[PDB]
């Protein structure tokens with residue numbers, strides 16, 4: 001039907017149908033008479049997978065022969081989502097599969113909905129890793145993603161009586177057709193033990209062994225026949241483990257628990273032993289693989305053939321593990337090993353919130369990884385010797401820069417370790433990289449300014465435009481061709497259509513279709529009833545105080561109170577949608593979810609409001625839900641306190657899909673406004689500098705309560721039980737926090753936020769001008785392609801040249 005989905009040739013369609021029937025019979029062992037939609041999904045997935053295999057084998061063969069520099073992207077999280085559609089898009093098979101399935105009496109869109117998300121991440125960091133893999137393959141880089149195959153990914157969220165409940169995400173129950181187990185490349189990982197010093201150096205002995213078994217998943221590039229590998233490790237006990245008899249076998253679970261479950265803490269550090277085991281497990285297995293591959297061609301050439309990118313500090317143990325292998329096993333002298341390590345490793349920082357920074361207690365490392373602790377101390381002593389030589393007499397600087405933090409509990413600061421041991425350190429948006437140089441890593445920047453870089457984040461336009469919004473992709477392709485899908489800067493050509501009446505109409509029509517489609521999804525799967533002519537005002541992201549879902553709540557109540565005061569005055573109708581998961585132990589985030597649903601309970605059932613205001617909590621926000629709601633959005637809420645959101649990437653997804661943004665000058669919002677023009681963005685609130693000025697005189701929330709009557713009314717409603725008649729004190733923790741210990745200054749941006757929201761509503765009343773502003777946003781979104789981000793990493797950090805060249809088919 002639509003051009004960007006590729007050709008449906010008679011030969012191809014016939015062959016797909018034949019292979020579908022072959023897999024249904026031989027692979028699934030079903031006849032058509034008892035096959036369910038799920039069986040049909042698997043038969044299609046196996047059919048599409050067969051097309052990846054030849055390309056995967058020959059890509060990996062090509063790397064063995066050409067021996068390019070290899071890029072290893074180490075992450076504890078890869079938030080992949082569904083694979084079927086993405087694979088079809090990247091291999092140009094979507095229309096052919098659509099036709100093949102149609103001729104078999106099946107609806108492919110229905111089959112796609114059966115696939116589970118691969119939910120092996122918490123949110124933005126994990127999803128960035130996934131976008132990056134897609135871009136590295138599309139740019140022809142010899143890149144490998146390395147992580148952990150969690151049996152249970154991010155929990156499924158249920159809402160019961162307005163409260164979040166967690167359920168295990170048993171994503172592997174029905175099998176995963178995309179992975180290939182490679183039990184033949186299983187490797188040992190060591191824990192505990194002790195260090196012996198011989199005349200031949202240190203030996204780490206009496207260790208407990210856990211096996212790391214790899215599972216490989218293909219990562220197809222966009223129409224270039226490149227298929228790279230994501231290798232995920234699973235924990236297995238050795239067969240002599242604990243070897244009365246029955247109990248010894250049952251106790252294998254203690255080893256296998258390492259890969260059982262993803263820690264569900266977005267932007268927060270929990271210093272648990274199991275998490276440290278996960279971190280070392282991924283590092284130790286991965287580094288053995290890296291070294292094996294390097295030896296199958298003298299370590300002076302190691303950094304010319306290997307780059308290791310550390311996705312935050314979570315894999316920071318790679319630095320002392322690489323030193324361990326080089327010094328203890330390969331017998332390099334320390335200085336040579338350190339040179340190799342620093343030239344090989346690079347570190348990306350993703351947060352400045354102090355509670356998110358990894359600081360491991362020394363006693364944990366001492367017990368679990370005694371050789372690594374010795375190596376860390378040695379790194380620290382040598383590093384501080386350089387500091388003292390550069391800044392003689394500056395004793396306070398020595399204390400601030402130490403890898404070892406003093407206190408009642410001594411800790412290792414993993415970010416300091418990463419900076420010391422990496423040739424490049426980057427933040428993830430311009431304002432964030434500047435904050436790193438001015439504040440938390442200022443001392444390090446002064447010692448080694450050359451290390452510090454910026455790499456502004458991006459998103460893949462394959463998943464986040466072509467896949468999730470084919471209607472928009474198509475109307476763009478009609479005007480400017482298909483080349484923009486792998487060169488997103490070409491969207492700039494759309495600025496020459498901003499006064500074209502037909503284009504304006506088509507852009508608005510696509511949005512309307514997406515809104516209708518989403519409104520129907522809501523009715524069918526969640527029995528809820530929304531007005532699709534209303535402005536769709538959407539805030540979807542993990543629940544956190546810094547992201548200020550609470551500021552949104554205050555605006556919603558303000559609108560409700562204004563309607564109740566003047567019910568017969570016209571207001572632009574809104575559907576306010578808020579969704580996101582709270583970490584299970586984060587009490588305040590769970591209370592925020594409850595507040596949102598409680599506001600909905602009052603607003604949605606007030607007959608005076610009518611369909612002018614609806615408040616919906618979107619349950620179980622995840623990648624597959626993002627693909628549905630983002631194309632349907634009119635207004636994107638990006639309202640973190642200035643200085644707290646390192647980048648954001650949801651922001652970019654909404655820009656690409658024809659929503660306007662209301663936001664603070666935080667993270668990548670700054671660069672988005674710069675690209676589109678500030679006049680095409682709804683900017684409000686304190687800048688970073690304003691937050692600092694407030695912190696210096698002291699934030700007093702009472703001042704705002706005293707001066708703003710509308711705000712006082714809301715706080716009185718919350719306090720007195722207006723939104724919780726059965727439990728009048730239910731929200732007292734929220735009120736107490738806002739009034740007395742709000743680190744994120746919600747009240748300080750309230751007035752400017754409400755005023756800015758009034759300007760949004762005013763513009764929405766003029767659909768032609770709303771749509772013209774949308775075109776100006778979509779047209780300038782090109783910078784936010786992860787292809788751009790990855791080309792910068794490749795050239796400025798890894799030392800490799802990207803390529804758009806096709807491999808042979």
Ligand SMILES: O=[N+](O)c1ccc(-c2n[nH]c([C@@H]3O[C@H](CO)[C@@H](O)[C@H](O)[C@H]3O)n2)cc1
Nearest residue numbers: 124125265267350351428645646647648649
């Ligand atoms: O222990 N843990 O399970 C985690 C700890 C920290 C994070 C994290 N830091 N920054 C981001 C996000 O990274 C994203 C990608 O750079 C940014 O866009 C966003 O601003 C930032 O908040 N996540 C995740 C998990």
Ligand SMILES: O=c1[nH]cnc2c1ncn2[C@@H]1O[C@@H](COP(=O)(O)O)[C@@H](O)[C@H]1O
Nearest residue numbers: 057058060061062063064065185293296
């Ligand atoms: O000794 C060899 N002979 C031929 N091909 C090899 C050899 N070793 C590795 N390869 C190729 O590279 C491999 C890719 O897997 P890797 O060993 O995980 O990098 C195989 O799939 C082969 O295509």
Ligand SMILES: *Cc1c(COP(=O)(O)O)cnc(C)c1O
Nearest residue numbers: 123124541622623626648649650
């Ligand atoms: C993009 C995305 C995120 C990140 O959104 P932010 O608004 O940048 O925090 C989180 N979760 C999911 C499922 C995503 O697709």
